[PDB]
Design a protein around this nucleic acid. Structure first.
Length: 365
DNA sequence: ATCAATATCCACCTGCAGATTCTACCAAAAGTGTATTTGGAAACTGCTCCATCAAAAGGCATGTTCAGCTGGTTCAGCTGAACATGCCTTTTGATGGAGCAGTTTCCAAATACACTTTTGGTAGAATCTGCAGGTGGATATTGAT
């Protein structure tokens, strides 16, 4: 609610219609408007349970109300809102086959890629049929951790708990599996505006920017950014120019195109890591310069706000400070994951044993 | 309330197998030296193990009913303690005679050192099979009436 200097929306809109004022000023004002209306999301719309804990989340890119989610026990759910047709389910071993990475297929929306603790990077349908296994550990106590895909390049990529990343085509053709790190890789991600430089994060207190076509020589990498603590995720923006990274103790950093090494800014925020808790992953908003993250208080962290609850915090990217706080009782669990729709009208949250939807207010005639 | 009557304890005494100590003989304990091998400081490395302390399933802390134990009481019948009284085995010394423990000695044969050759046991990859779980059906079990 509390917001900084800004005014004259209809004025700015007409000035844009005249060509006087540039578009980004309007974009700033409307980012402010979106946060303002986000302060009226307070009425939590929907809750959804199933069995063992949620571990990974993904949005159907084309459709707003549908979402896919993967559990701690190999349990996948596909769920649509306003349908009430008893959502789609598939079970797994339930104990040690925790899926941990999940993105939709841009081609066949009723498919999905997945990375499992069983040691099986697979591509499987929501109907149960395993389409194709992509890799394998072939030795237990060695499993996969990370996964992503790109369509413009037609590439698939996935990371391990030991330090090596794999890169395949949609029809196999594996020319990769060189080692990148010495320990587990939490997240990996591809650029949207270009197609052939990559980002990876790990427990090594380092996050790495790669050139997936040019480097082949066992740590002849392109760039390496250090950290004070491990990193749970490093995710690109949709514009491709601002890279977000998130630690385990208390930090977020924004790196630019210009000198990947040096940082533009650091966004301190506590999301302290824990064993049985699902690891925390900050995320962009696809069409603004906002960031949305879940909080996990630490009594020792120097809080700027005087009220410290298990809240969902939102920030502006290119400034550093906050603009909104989501909270709803009956949901005092801790939203490990939070992801806005690529559409831009709906938000999904993953708490322990719960999936939540935070949509906007329904008005009265 | 006392008294009769057993058994034991406390004090003194005298004489003896065991205690002790003194004495002669000695293989074992300390000296001395060389030869050979060993804990322990330093480094390395890679398995295993404690710090952290959300959130739900399900086990436990509480509270209730009432049904079988426990633990008091009673008492009739059976028994071990006490004891007499007698008497057969055990003791214990003594002796006398046969076997065995140990003590020596010699010696073929049982056995350790050590060189060298092969190979059963181990371990990591590769394949299989059957206990778990599941599901359903037919029998057994159990308590109110």
């Amino acid at each position: 609610q509390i917001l900084p200097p800004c005014r004259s929306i209809v004025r700015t809109l007409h000035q844009h219609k005249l060509g006087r004022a540039s578009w980004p000023s309007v974009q700033q004002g409307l980012q402010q408007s979106f946060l303002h209306t986000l302060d009226s999301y307070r009425i939590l719309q929907k809750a959804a349970p199933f069995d063992r804990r949620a571990t990974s989340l993904a949005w159907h890119p084309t459709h707003p109300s549908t979402v896919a989610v993967g559990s701690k026990g190999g349990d996948i759910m596909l769920w649509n809102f306003g349908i009430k047709d008893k959502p789609t389910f598939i079970k797994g071993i339930g104990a040690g086959g925790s899926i941990t990475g999940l993105k939709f297929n841009p081609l066949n929306t009723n498919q999905f890629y997945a990375s499992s603790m069983e040691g099986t990077t697979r591509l499987q349908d929501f109907k149960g049929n395993i389409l194709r296994v992509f890799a394998s550990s072939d030795t237990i106590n060695i499993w996969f951790c990370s996964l992503d895909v790109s369509a413009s390049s037609r590439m698939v990529v996935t990371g391990d708990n030991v330090g090596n990343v794999i890169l395949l085509n949609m029809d196999g053709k594996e020319l990769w599996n060189l080692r990148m790190h010495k320990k587990k890789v939490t997240h990996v991600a591809l650029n949207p505006c270009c197609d052939w430089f990559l980002a990876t994060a790990s427990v090594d207190q380092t996050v790495k920017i790669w050139d997936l076509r040019q480097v082949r020589g066992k740590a002849s990498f392109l760039y390496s950014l250090p950290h004070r603590h491990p990193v749970n995720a490093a995710c690109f923006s949709p514009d491709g120019a601002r890279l977000l990274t998130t630690d385990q103790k208390s930090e977020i950093r924004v790196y630019s195109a210009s000198q990947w090494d040096c940082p533009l800014g650091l966004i301190p925020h506590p999301h302290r890591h824990f064993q049985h808790l699902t690891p925390i992953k900050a995320a962009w908003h696809p069409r603004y310069n906002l960031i949305v993250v879940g909080r996990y208080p630490d009594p020792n962290f120097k809080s700027c706000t005087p009220y410290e609850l298990r809240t969902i915090d939102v920030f502006d990217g290119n400034s550093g400070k906050m603009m909104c706080q989501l909270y709803d009782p009956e949901s005092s669990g801790i939203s490990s994951l939070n992801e806005f729709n690529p559409m831009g009208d709906t938000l999904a949250s993953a708490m322990g044993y719960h999936i939540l939807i935070w949509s906007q207010e329904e008005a009265r005639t």
